[PDB]
RNA sequence: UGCUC
DNA sequence: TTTAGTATATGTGCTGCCGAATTGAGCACGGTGTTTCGTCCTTTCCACAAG
DNA sequence: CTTGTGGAAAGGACGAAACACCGTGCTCAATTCGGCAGCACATATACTAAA
């Protein structure tokens, strides 16, 4: 007749699992595909486009407009995420140092691990011991990462792996091909011989023959990535359930929902307000056409490149808005805030919304002396009394008081503003209907938020706080005047 | 400039070539129809083992009957270390 | 190498199990390990894995090492998982080169793993009773004749023997016996007098007992490859280069080992003198054949002496070079076209080029050429080798020439493979289940005349069998099998351009 | 002849149509000559130099079909076969030889014969899988998996 | 820590959040288990 | 919001914090930073560790394993943020028992 | 920016 | 064969070009918002020739 | 003094391109301070050569 299942489970998060999604997990996470770079439509309604930014399946930022996915409004939307494909991958800046230190641990031609069964048995016996901290995992990673730049020949394919580094930005130089003073060996002699078409075609090859090593593109990790085994991963301290290599190089971008976009409708003009997360991804859409057309049209190679460097400098100011290694000609114009803006500084999310975050049922008022009043109590003037409401449940011992005050009305200052029922959570406001019959109607259970009267304790601070005695908890008692006033002998721990 | 596209790509875009058949012969004929004889033996080879079924309704007087009966090979214990006897 | 773990993760669950397979990808993701570790990572009982690592273990997929402290640790082949696939290929080369006794010799060598020379001569008896009938029985001798002939080819091998306890360290018995290998008796096959004759499955103390026997899976891989130089040397110049370099290469195989740059310099007396009198051939088209080899662009073979008239050697590393480009250029081709192909093959030819110059030697328009190079840069069938005129690298002032690299780009097409592979065996299993319900109704009402075929059988129960609703999907079954077919077939012929990817990526490692 | 004009150049348009009747027929002559050298099996070298065609000999036979009115020189022909070459299809050979009726390299002189290719088509290009444009997605569990493959479904009809 | 449940929101481990609190109901740990008859 | 004439409510800033922190009170830290200024029911998925909506997880199509979470709405902005840097946080949820 | 403390 | 010289080989040790931090808040206000450079379409108004 | 058929111009959308007309072009560093990566470069160890 009717299936067993749960209501509501009190679930106690127990420990956050970091990790990274690949590109089929980011396109099954995500809900559409989002491919226009416009952001409204060419009516003058300026509806948002379909499978393009700003669209409203992807959670909404407006009152009056809500989300197509779930049927909602602004308030109960949590948001959707969408997928944007890429032409051509692109270095994760995140995890472009990530990504050096394990080209710089894994051979470039058989893609194994620069270690011999010895060290890897060592190392996996060091790793197996229970109770493995960050520190430790990083000191392993530190150590396993020196003993891999020691060697400098594969034992596994016998490949020669010369020097990885990083020049320009986003780009990986690798020195297969370095210069040896005593006698060379075939394969560099070969690598320097096979340019005879290129030097008979462009002599200028021949003086710059020197210095060309092997050019690590997005395209050649990605696929070194790809077929790295398994057994390795352990090895680069990388967990495997978290994540794989072939995730650190980025080939779909997940464009977050419109709560973390909010777009703000100035119809004062003809323009509207928007962030420039959204700005940049459609920057990121406009380049990846453009990448399309000139694959379609056969530009040249140089100006490809060009492209393709420029998508990457865009997906990481859109990543990391701040980096150093800009050129001057690639340089940004204007500022623009990204990610880890949003994330670090004062007025970021760490230290602006989660250690520090602003709250309601709060006053803040001049103080004044008054040394008829009790050390432990504070006087508070009665306009902000009448503001600043307490939740009482109606009970069998406070039933006539909080009738009494129902009875007064939010005008009278001993009394209560909003009640709020036991079986329906729709709130009632006191000013209008007929309050008495709302007092001869109070059932146990319900919710009054009355007046803050006397005996009520209340936190009462200074702002800068140096010691903890700068917050106290103290009773507060209704006055007539518009002051906070409190006992003189108090003023020593707040200063 | 690029053009603005209004549907996202198809999930499966058309390809003007197509795989080339595969060969022909009585020998390709031969391993496929040796692969599959493999396959229909190899399940029923004591070296399959299947996952042990568990949580029994009931006991009954037909469980001699339905019996599953099949004969087990015997590992050579002098190979292999003594940490995998029973 | 997750493509490789996927496929074998499917090869383990399609032939051994689920709670096996399980601990063969457990193994071949995280190591050696011991055993302990591996039972508690895993999640299952203790006994479960030990029969997995012991049905494992018994066809050479997993090897047992011993370490400090006496703790043994179980370390899986993913190579020898890989193989596994190519177990159709080896029956059917080993029914091809020898008779139907070599082949179930080898099927049982291959389903069993590891055993006794008895058991396998047994069971190769029992089961070939059945192919013949009249009464006529089938003798151990002949058996044990086609055993020691492929024995003494290298194609089935003794497995390594545990040494004798009582003479090495007796007393306290190690954890592990440490099984070592011998090349002494490695193809020595045992004196088994005791004969016998196979039973007709009628339903109605061991002299070579310790002495385990295997497929020699290195032999046949160097069979496949004297077999696919062969193919090649005959399509291009003719059937009898290809006679010559078989003879060759058989000549070689003994007295070379599976793995060098050059095998043994032949002269051409003994080539001549070992050729099969098949051939009205004489000594001077002899030698302006291999002459004439010597000089051809592909470099099959080398002159490398000319002592004893004429001394000729055979590239076989240069010959595995050739066929894997010339994969390579098949396999762009057949995906990008002819022209794409062309540019490919300039491209290659040409160690370093330009988009212009590609478009001078090619002579395809503008707008088509570079879209071909990009796509083939889109799929890492090249790179660009990007010189710089200052340490910048700024793209506006540096050159890009393009340039294949074939190991890379042969790395990324045995990932392909193995991936194409692994989906093919997804889409069969996939098509099983979903009509798994229409297999099991064909099932049974085929059993229903598979029972009482001759006992109690009467007339009656042959119309109605197709009476049922089954004749309308007997059109769905028969798509079914036809998809299964086809599936298997593209799954063993990608086993072939597999294995060429896989030596031409052996044969060019050292190993130092 | 670079900055303007040319052979395949007609009024700055490339004709393809042009240097595909070209590789044809130049195609066609070298297999002919191949299957004549083969048929006569007189001799294996004197096969190998039958099959042979230098470039002087196809440009006058091309000069001979007279398939376009514009006059194609002989270097031209040569970057033709060049092109040939690269199509996987035919094989060249530099012989050494002073003087003779070509007279064009010094000392050197270029012989072309059809070839036929090393191996047949691979495996890989004998599955959907190994020509799919959209093999990076492929995924067990998702949009694009094999068991709901468009690819392999009609491949399996076919 | 500390910071981590001031941000997930939930009570921090130091200060009142260090024991726990059990209520002191009228109750019979292991009550009587009904006999079963057909076992 | 931060001004009075934007109807902006105080702010409990770091030293706050600390103060609280200081005095042990957890529970009124927690009803000042989580249930009077940013407090929210999310849906999390046990299986994924994702975030869900209405009670149902788009990454696995499953409802059987999505609970509700009380948590600051500025926690989960975190979290979306991370998300989208592929910093994905995988939630392994609890009993509070 | 100006301030308030 | 053995002591002395040459080379390599890595280690280690001193710089110099990077990336990151710099009190808590409260309160007012004035600015300005992405655009803009050139081309084309549309609409309007007025140089003369006409009543 | 009213009028009109045709013409010019001015204003407002609109699309190619990239917020600077041309290609230049500067200054200052805001103060530590803990990483580092290069180079360098040193010293000794090992091996080859002369006696
Ligand atoms: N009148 C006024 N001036 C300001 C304000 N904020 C900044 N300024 C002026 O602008 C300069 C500093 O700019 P910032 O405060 O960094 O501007 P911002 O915070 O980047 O701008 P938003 O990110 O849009 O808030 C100072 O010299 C101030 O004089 C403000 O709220 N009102
Ligand atoms: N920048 C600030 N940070 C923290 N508190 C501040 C700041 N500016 C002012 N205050 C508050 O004001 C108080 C400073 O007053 P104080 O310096 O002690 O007297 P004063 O201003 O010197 O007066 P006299 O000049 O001595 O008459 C203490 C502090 O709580
Ligand atoms: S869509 Fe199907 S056929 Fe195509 S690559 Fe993916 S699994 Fe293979
Ligand atoms: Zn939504
Ligand atoms: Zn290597
Ligand atoms: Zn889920």
Redesign the pocket.
Do not use: A, I
């Given at each position: 007749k009717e299936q067993f299942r749960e209501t509501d489970v009190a679930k106690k998060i127990s420990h956050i699992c970091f990790g990274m999604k690949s590109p089929e997990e980011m396109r099954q996470q995500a809900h559409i595909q989002v491919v226009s770079?416009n952001?409204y439509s060419?009516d003058n309604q300026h509806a948002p486009l379909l499978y393009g930014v700003l669209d409203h399946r992807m959670g909404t930022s407006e009152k009056d407009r809500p989300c197509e996915t779930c049927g909602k409004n602004l308030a109960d939307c949590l948001g959707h995420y969408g997928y944007i494909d890429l032409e051509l991958p692109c270095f994760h800046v995140g995890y472009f140092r990530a990504v050096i230190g394990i080209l710089q641990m894994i051979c470039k031609t058989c893609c194994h691990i620069m270690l011999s069964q010895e060290e890897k048995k060592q190392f996996l016996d060091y790793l197996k011991r229970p109770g493995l901290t960050y520190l430790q995992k990083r000191g392993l990673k530190?150590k396993i990462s020196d003993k891999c730049r020691?060697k400098?020949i594969c034992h596994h394919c016998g490949a020669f792996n010369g020097?990885v580094?990083?020049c320009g930005l986003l780009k990986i130089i690798h020195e297969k091909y370095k210069t040896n003073?005593?006698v060379v060996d075939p394969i560099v002699s070969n690598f320097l011989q096979s340019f005879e078409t290129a030097i008979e075609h462009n002599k200028e090859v021949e003086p710059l023959l020197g210095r060309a090593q092997e050019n690590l593109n997005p395209l050649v990790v990605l696929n070194l990535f790809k077929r790295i085994p398994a057994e390795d991963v352990p090895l680069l301290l990388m967990n495997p359930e978290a994540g794989k290599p072939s995730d650190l190089i980025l080939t779909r971008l997940l464009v977050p929902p419109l709560c973390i976009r909010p777009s703000?409708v100035?119809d004062?003009?003809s323009?509207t307000?928007?962030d420039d997360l959204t700005?940049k991804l459609?920057?990121i859409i406009?380049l990846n056409d453009?990448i399309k057309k000139h694959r379609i049209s056969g530009a040249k190679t140089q100006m490809i490149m060009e492209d393709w460097d420029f998508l990457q400098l865009q997906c990481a100011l859109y990543i990391?808005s701040?980096?150093?290694?800009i050129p001057?000609?690639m340089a940004?114009?204007?500022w623009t805030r990204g990610f880890?803006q949003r994330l670090?500084?004062?007025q970021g999310r760490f230290?602006?919304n989660l250690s520090?975050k602003?709250v309601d049922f709060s006053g803040?008022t001049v103080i004044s002396p008054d040394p008829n009043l009790r050390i432990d109590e504070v006087a508070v003037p009665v306009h902000v009394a009448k503001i600043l409401t307490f939740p009482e449940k109606v009970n069998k011992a406070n039933i006539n008081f909080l009738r009494k005050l129902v009875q007064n009305g939010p005008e009278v200052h001993p009394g209560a503003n909003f009640i709020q029922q036991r079986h329906t959570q729709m709130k009632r406001f006191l000013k209008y209907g007929n309050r008495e019959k709302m007092a001869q109607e109070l059932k146990y259970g319900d919710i009054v938020e009355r007046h803050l009267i006397d005996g009520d304790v209340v936190l009462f601070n200074?702002?800068?706080?140096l010691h903890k005695l700068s917050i106290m908890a103290h009773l507060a008692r209704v006055k007539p005047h518009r002051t906070f006033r409190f006992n003189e002998c108090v003023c020593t721990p707040y200063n | 400039?690029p053009?603005v596209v209004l549907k996202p790509p198809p999930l499966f875009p058309d390809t003007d070539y197509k795989p080339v058949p595969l060969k022909t012969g009585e020998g390709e004929e031969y391993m496929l129809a040796l692969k599959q004889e493999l396959r229909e033996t190899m399940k029923r080879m004591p070296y399959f083992i299947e996952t042990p079924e568990e949580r029994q309704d009931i006991e009954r007087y037909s469980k001699r009957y339905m019996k599953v009966y099949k004969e087990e090979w015997i590992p050579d214990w002098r190979r292999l270390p003594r940490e995998m006897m029973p | 190498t997750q493509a490789e773990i996927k496929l074998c993760s499917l090869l383990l669950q399609e032939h051994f199990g689920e709670i096996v397979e399980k601990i063969g990808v457990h193994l071949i993701r995280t190591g050696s390990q011991p055993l302990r570790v591996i039972a508690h990572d895993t999640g299952t009982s203790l006994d479960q894995v030990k029969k997995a690592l012991c049905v494992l273990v018994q066809h050479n997929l997993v090897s047992y090492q011993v370490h400090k402290r006496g703790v043994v640790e179980y370390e899986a082949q993913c190579s020898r998982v890989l193989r596994m696939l190519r177990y159709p290929r080896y029956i059917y080369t080993t029914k091809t080169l020898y008779s139907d006794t070599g082949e179930l010799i080898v099927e049982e060598l291959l389903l069993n793993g590891k055993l006794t020379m008895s058991a396998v001569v047994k069971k190769v008896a029992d089961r070939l009773t059945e192919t013949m009938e009249d009464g006529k029985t089938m003798d151990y001798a002949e058996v044990s004749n086609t055993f020691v002939r492929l024995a003494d080819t290298h194609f089935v091998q003794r497995c390594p023997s545990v040494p004798t306890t009582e003479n090495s360290d007796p007393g306290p018995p190690p954890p592990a016996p440490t099984l070592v290998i011998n090349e002494k008796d490695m193809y020595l096959v045992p004196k088994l007098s005791l004969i016998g004759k196979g039973k007709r499955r009628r339903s109605s103390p061991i002299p070579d007992d310790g002495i385990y026997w295997q497929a020699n899976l290195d032999r046949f891989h160097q069979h496949f490859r004297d077999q696919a130089i062969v193919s090649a040397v005959a399509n291009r110049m003719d059937q009898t280069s290809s006679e010559i370099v078989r003879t060759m290469l058989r000549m070689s195989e003994i007295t070379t080992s599976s793995s060098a740059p050059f095998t043994q310099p032949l002269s051409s007396n003994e080539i001549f003198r070992s050729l099969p009198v098949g051939y009205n051939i004489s000594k001077q088209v002899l030698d302006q054949y291999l002459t004439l080899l010597a000089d051809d662009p592909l470099e099959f073979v080398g002159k490398s002496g000319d002592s004893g008239g004429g001394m000729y050697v055979i590239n076989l590393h240069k010959a595995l070079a050739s066929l894997a480009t010339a994969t390579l250029e098949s396999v762009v081709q057949e995906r990008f076209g002819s022209r794409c192909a062309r540019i490919f093959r300039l491209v290659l030819q040409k160690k370093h080029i330009e988009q212009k110059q590609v478009e001078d030697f090619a002579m395809i328009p503008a707008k088509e050429a570079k879209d071909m190079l990009y796509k083939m840069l889109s799929e890492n069938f090249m790179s660009l080798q990007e010189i710089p005129k200052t340490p910048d690298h700024a793209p506006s002032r540096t050159f890009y020439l393009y340039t294949v690299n074939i190991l890379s780009a042969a790395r990324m097409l045995l990932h392909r493979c193995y991936k194409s592979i692994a989906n093919l065996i997804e889409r069969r299993q996939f098509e099983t289940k979903e009509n798994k319900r229409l297999l099991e109704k064909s099932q049974r009402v085929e059993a229903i005349i598979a029972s009482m075929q001759a006992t109690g059988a009467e007339e009656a129960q042959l119309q109605e069998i197709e009476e049922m609703i089954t004749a309308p999907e007997r059109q769905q079954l028969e798509t079914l099998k036809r998809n299964v077919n086809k599936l298997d077939a593209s799954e063993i012929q990608v086993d072939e351009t597999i294995f060429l990817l896989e030596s031409y990526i052996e044969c060019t490692m050292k190993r130092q | 002849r670079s900055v303007t004009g040319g052979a395949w150049y007609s009024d700055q348009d490339f004709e393809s149509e042009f240097v595909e009747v070209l590789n044809q027929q130049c195609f066609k002559f070298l297999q002919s000559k191949a299957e004549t050298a083969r048929e006569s099996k007189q001799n294996p070298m004197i096969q190998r130099n039958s099959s042979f065609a230098s470039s002087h000999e196809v440009w006058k036979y091309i000069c001979e079909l007279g398939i376009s009115k514009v006059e194609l020189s002989m270097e031209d022909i040569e970057t033709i076969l060049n092109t040939l070459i690269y199509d996987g299809k035919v094989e060249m050979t530099i012989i050494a030889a002073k003087e003779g009726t070509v007279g064009s390299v010094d000392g050197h002189m270029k012989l072309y014969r059809a070839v036929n290719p090393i191996i047949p088509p691979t495996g890989l290009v004998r599955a959907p899988c190994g020509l799919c444009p959209v093999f990076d997605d492929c995924h067990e569990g998702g949009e694009i998996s094999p068991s709901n493959c468009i690819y392999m479904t009609e491949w399996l009809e076919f | 820590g500390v910071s981590e449940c001031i941000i997930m929101g939930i009570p921090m481990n130091i200060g009142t959040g260090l024991f726990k609190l059990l209520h002191k109901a009228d109750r019979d740990p292991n009550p009587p288990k009904r006999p079963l008859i057909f076992d | 919001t931060?001004?009075?004439?934007?109807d902006?409510?105080?702010?409990?800033?770091?030293?706050?914090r600390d103060c609280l922190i200081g005095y042990g009170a957890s529970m009124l830290l927690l009803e000042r930073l989580m249930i009077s200024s940013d407090a929210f029911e999310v849906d999390v998925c046990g299986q994924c560790g994702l975030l869900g909506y209405s009670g149902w997880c788009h990454y696995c199509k499953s409802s059987c394993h999505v609970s509700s979470l009380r948590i600051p709405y500025a926690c989960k902005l975190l979290f979306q943020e991370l998300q989208s840097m592929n910093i994905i946080p995988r939630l392994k949820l609890s009993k509070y028992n």
């Open positions: 770079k952001l060419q530190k020691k400098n020097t580094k990083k003073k005593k703000v100035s004062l003009k323009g307000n928007e700005m459609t920057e406009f453009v990391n701040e980096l150093s290694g001057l000609n940004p114009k204007k880890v670090k500084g004062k230290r602006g520090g602003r803040r200074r702002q800068p706080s | 400039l053009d | - | - | - | 931060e001004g009075r004439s934007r902006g409510g105080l702010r409990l800033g770091e030293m706050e």
